[model samples]
Target: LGAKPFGEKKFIEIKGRRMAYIDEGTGDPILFQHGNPTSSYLWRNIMPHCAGLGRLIACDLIGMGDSDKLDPSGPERYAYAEHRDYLDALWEALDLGDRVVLVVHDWGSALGFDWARRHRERVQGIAYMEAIAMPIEWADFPEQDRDLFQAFRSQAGEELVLQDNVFVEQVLPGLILRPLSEAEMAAYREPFLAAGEARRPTLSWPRQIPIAGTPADVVAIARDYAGWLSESPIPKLFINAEPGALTTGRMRDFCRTWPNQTEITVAGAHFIQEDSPDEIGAAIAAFVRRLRPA
Candidate 1:
């Protein structure tokens, strides 16, 4: 079957909150992590291609997808650290063991790298595309995207993301090279439409982008992970896309500095999964096979 309509829904509790995830096949785990404004659904297509390769799994970040949201009075709700804490708890709950392979994108890349760096023995490999590979400077963003990101970090972000739901309605579709089917778009829109003002996770992500030295915590995480990634002997796959939204020329060069990395260029933009799922899936499958040779 195709990846359309997503697969079965599964939930795990962390700190009294339900986190939604999809788990399929069986073997060593290959965990897929998605970035902002998207969820585990982002891996629907890619997962099937890697069937039988491992126990393929993807989870919706706490406030996104079908996962439970924190109460309005909750402490520092929707912040980057909050998300990280919940994700960390999920890992502990799953007890995925030491043979985990991570396939991540966007903010997921940063989070995954941070976890891998801290638990170096747990992660066996990482395959990423359109990743936030390092702490970003305002100048690092594409000229056309700089103003929009600046707006995302400003008071205007409330109107653009929260009020307008621009991330789901406009930005998500705009970034992909291929037009998303109505069902695909609707699947993405459903969670945000249900979230209403609780769509803070989407807005919070852009603000957490670590531009300049602001959001110092995230910047430090990225810095630490970047150093580990460059020196670690772990296998890595960097799937580059043409004129990517986040993984631009400078980011590509930075990714190249990492040891034991295999890079492949695919035709697409920022959301390469939507634009080139087949190619990405095939590439990831090949990479994973090499990591766990039979």
Candidate 2:
């Protein structure tokens, strides 16, 4: 009876695997969607603060965090774009409806954005951090990023992904204000125990980026987002982090670029929640404060 017990873990099976998630608290549902490098566990402190005010749901996307592991991974099947599709299936599985407040970060931003793009009317509010919504417009990337991408994206080794966990440990740790606690770290680490499971998406994600040359589907997704921005009528807020490799400058740009986008700034890097939990939580709380059941 001396084991480090896990939490009341829950999984909703999807794509031949149980997609891990947590649905706690009670009231209007608040969906917390996380991105790569972190999972639903990233919201541990966050859920408690808002759950009493509204139901909070967080997910561990496949191949990352506590979600199910898959045999093989590729874009057509298990990458972010398709993960967006899986989310739709998940909504259908849960019979989800309107007035949903979406809280998103990192890659989860793309996932949630695609969903919001498809169903703008259902969106109640959005709290976005270090999130990307467009193709890599040269003005968007930070300096020396080309070299960083080459380090990971370069096709030098077809199996390089089989070796890189630096992002999970070294790179990501410093990006956030505080390094994660032991148990907190495990929630991020346990899922990527094997290089194979971790490598696929880690590797696939960078290559999927649309740079000087545009890939077909990348172009299509961008085109879709462009149309989405033009027509969406939902109220949205972009909460950005400073000294970030992504999202801050873009947050302001998004507001200027889109019709209804609003923004606030927080301190941190890519992992805004890690550095600015209070600020992030307040942003969501305020959005929820205004949500009226119709």
Candidate 3:
């Protein structure tokens, strides 16, 4: 069952939402978290090869995938706080034991690192790529990035993402180096196809970029992870994609600054799993072999 349509579905209740997840094989757990507009489906291929090493658990974040949808545009929803709390609740319900390994990318990194920071003792190791691992000062950002964030919060941005589903057609397609086949894109596009509020998280996450220290709480959380990266003694594997947003020389330099981190670079873009699933799986399998289970 290697990355096809997934196996029997599983669900857990968090607040009023029904969260969908996939669980396979058994050992110490490798909890996978996905980013905006994508779900555990993102890990379907990567997790299969790592199944021998551990239990592979992946979940659709509340508003995306088969999980129940909620209007994320309201004040009551779609905050990083909302995403964090629901995940914490699910973690508790699952009763996943200590020493879990986190395999994360994109927004999943934010949620994964946030969870690990709060439960550091439970985290044995982290294997990740393309993560938002630190805070960005206003002055540090390039002009175009500043513009992008500013535009994301605008009315036009809402129109593009929520009303028109740009997150599905345009943004997701633009990120990968390789083109996705119609079937593959269909799987991803299916969740966000609905118009207006159901597509809210896609609109919500980009605007939460924490620009210029404005979203201080998220910046604080990101900084907390940065300090954790500096201080945590746990083993880590940091995979890199050449010339990508989160895998450039800057990320390589930062990873080198950590004491117990192993780094590798592969040819890919921001969505490395789509470009190099086997490499990601094999690297993780070898990394897991080096560690004692939880």
TM-score for each candidate, following the candidate numbering:
0.96, 0.87, 0.92
**What is the Cα-based lDDT of residue 9 in candidate 2?**
60
For residues 175-252, what per-residue lDDT tens digits would candidate 1 score against the true structure?
A: 888878878888888888843567778888888887898799988889889888989999999999986878886777
What is the C-alpha lDDT profile of model 3 across 146-183, one tens digit per residue? 45556667777777777788777776776677878878
Candidate closer to the true structure by TM-score (higher is better), 2 or 3? 3
Candidate 1 positional error at 51, Å? 0.6
Best by TM-score: 1
Which portions of model 3 show Cα errors greater than 4 Å?
1-3, 71-76, 138-147, 249-252
The alpha-carbon lDDT assigned to residue 13 of candidate 3 equals: 88
The weakest ten consecutive residues by lDDT in model 2 span 1-10
Q: For model 2, how big is the CA root-mean-square deviation?
A: 3.6
Cα-lDDT of candidate 3: 0.78
Instruction: In model 3, state the lDDT of residue 90.
Output: 84
- Computed on alpha carbons, the lDDT of every model, listed in order, comes to 0.85, 0.66, 0.78
Q: In angstroms, what RMSD does candidate 1 have relative to the true structure?
A: 1.6
